[PDB]
Amino acid sequence: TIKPNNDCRQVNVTQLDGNENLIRDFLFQNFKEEGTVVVGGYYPTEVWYNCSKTLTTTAYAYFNNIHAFYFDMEAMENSTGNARGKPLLFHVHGEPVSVIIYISAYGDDVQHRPLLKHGLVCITKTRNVDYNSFTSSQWNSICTGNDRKVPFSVIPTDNGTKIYGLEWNDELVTAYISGRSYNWNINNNWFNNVTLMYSRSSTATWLHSAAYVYQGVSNFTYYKLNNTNGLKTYEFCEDYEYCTGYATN
Ligand SMILES: *[C@@H]1O[C@H](CO[C@@H]2O[C@@H](C)[C@@H](O)[C@@H](O)[C@@H]2O)[C@@H](O[C@@H]2O[C@H](CO)[C@@H](O)[C@H](O)[C@H]2NC(C)=O)[C@H](O)[C@H]1NC(C)=O
Ligand SMILES: *[C@@H]1O[C@H](CO)[C@@H](O[C@@H]2O[C@H](CO)[C@@H](O)[C@H](O)[C@H]2NC(C)=O)[C@H](O)[C@H]1NC(C)=O
Ligand SMILES: *[C@@H]1O[C@H](CO)[C@@H](O[C@@H]2O[C@H](CO)[C@@H](O)[C@H](O)[C@H]2NC(C)=O)[C@H](O)[C@H]1NC(C)=O
Ligand SMILES: *[C@@H]1O[C@H](CO)[C@@H](O[C@@H]2O[C@H](CO)[C@@H](O)[C@H](O)[C@H]2NC(C)=O)[C@H](O)[C@H]1NC(C)=O
Ligand SMILES: *[C@@H]1O[C@H](CO)[C@@H](O)[C@H](O)[C@H]1NC(C)=O
Ligand SMILES: *[C@@H]1O[C@H](CO)[C@@H](O)[C@H](O)[C@H]1NC(C)=O
Ligand SMILES: *[C@@H]1O[C@H](CO)[C@@H](O)[C@H](O)[C@H]1NC(C)=O
């Protein structure tokens, strides 16, 4: 879904440290009973992207025509206490309202940042956003003015074993964090693309590293979920005309 670039590579997300059950626990969020069902939606696939760059130059990645965006992180150091995070910024476009999601770095050292709340949501109406000023200034002056600022705490205790994500339609926005989903009723004209900043220089809130893998989802996917005697398994469905009736009946 990305515009082609030389700094982005493909990885198998489940074949990583701590991601043994990253996607299974996401698919089994709603089907908590025993038996077999079929679930359909903009669910993540096996192959994700890991964009990185050796040099310390601000880089970008562009995702075109996507209806969902998911990412996963590594385990934060000293997760039981003063956890030190890793940075990541991405912007979901739209009119008249767009959303900037920023995960700052470091721990209980960033000035005027609430303790153990590494995540920031900036709901904005401004058209052109300067990312250098956003990721190079102090936290108190990052998202100010007439924009809406919502700090939030990513979970350091999960050790990066939970998937983070976002999905948007013309009438609802769903945010998946920890093992929960939160809804937002808003009428905005989404452009269905995301601009991701994955590499920059070290600054007041940014730390040069690569600890995230991301994926944009554009297609509808159907999974067969089978829960037998506590053993939970999922499989891809190929027959589209058969799984649309299996998920509805
Ligand atoms: C790992 O973090 C712990 C806990 O951090 C403390 O509690 C957090 C919730 C937050 O308020 C932090 O700012 C706190 O520091 C650290 O334990 C502290 O260690 C210092 C060492 O000088 C000690 O003075 C404090 O009393 C300790 N606090 C507690 C609550 O026990 C610990 O040092 C960190 N480990 C490493 C290796 O950095
Ligand atoms: C995301 O998609 C939007 C779709 O609106 C793109 O913005 C439009 O780009 C076209 C290019 O021909 C312009 O004609 C429109 O005026 C733009 N609309 C705006 C700016 O509201 C946007 O460029 C895309 N962003 C990407 C690919 O990063
Ligand atoms: C994405 O791929 C990059 C490749 O650059 C990985 O970077 C490696 O990170 C480790 C741990 O810090 C370093 O020791 C290696 O030297 C890096 N590899 C290089 C520079 O080629 C990065 O870990 C990957 N991101 C993940 C798996 O989340
Ligand atoms: C869900 O998984 C279970 C295994 O836990 C499958 O159970 C099999 O059922 C067949 C048909 O009765 C038996 O012959 C096999 O011995 C069972 N397998 C095991 C390992 O016990 C069950 O079929 C699966 N459901 C679907 C729809 O594939
Ligand atoms: C994922 O694993 C499969 C099976 O081994 C392999 O063919 C594929 O290349 C892997 N994808 C990667 C390494 O991006
Ligand atoms: C995360 O790891 C820590 C030790 O590093 C452990 O105490 C904690 O239970 C782990 N959390 C999960 C969800 O596995
Ligand atoms: C997504 O669906 C399109 C048709 O809309 C198809 O051509 C394409 O192969 C699909 N991509 C993936 C990754 O499944």
Summarize the structure.
By secondary structure, the chain is mainly beta. It is built from 3 helices and 16 strands. Strand 6 and strand 7 form a beta hairpin.
From the spread of the alpha carbons, the general shape counts as globular
Number of domains: 1
Order of helices and strands: EHEEEEEEEHEEEEEEEEH
Structural classification: mainly beta
Description:
A six-stranded antiparallel sheet has the order 4-13-6-7-8-9, with no helix packed on it. Strands 12-11-10-5-14 form a five-stranded antiparallel sheet, with no helix packed on it. Helices cover 7% and strands 40% of the residues. The chain has three helices and 16 strands. It has a single domain, classed as Jelly Rolls (Sandwich). Strand 6 and strand 7 (98-103) form a beta hairpin. The chain is mainly β and 249 residues long. Bound molecules: a molecule of 3 linked components (NAG-NAG-FUC), a molecule of 2 linked components (NAG-NAG) (3 copies) and 2-acetamido-2-deoxy-beta-D-glucopyranose (3 copies). One 2-acetamido-2-deoxy-beta-D-glucopyranose is lined by residues 10-12, 47.
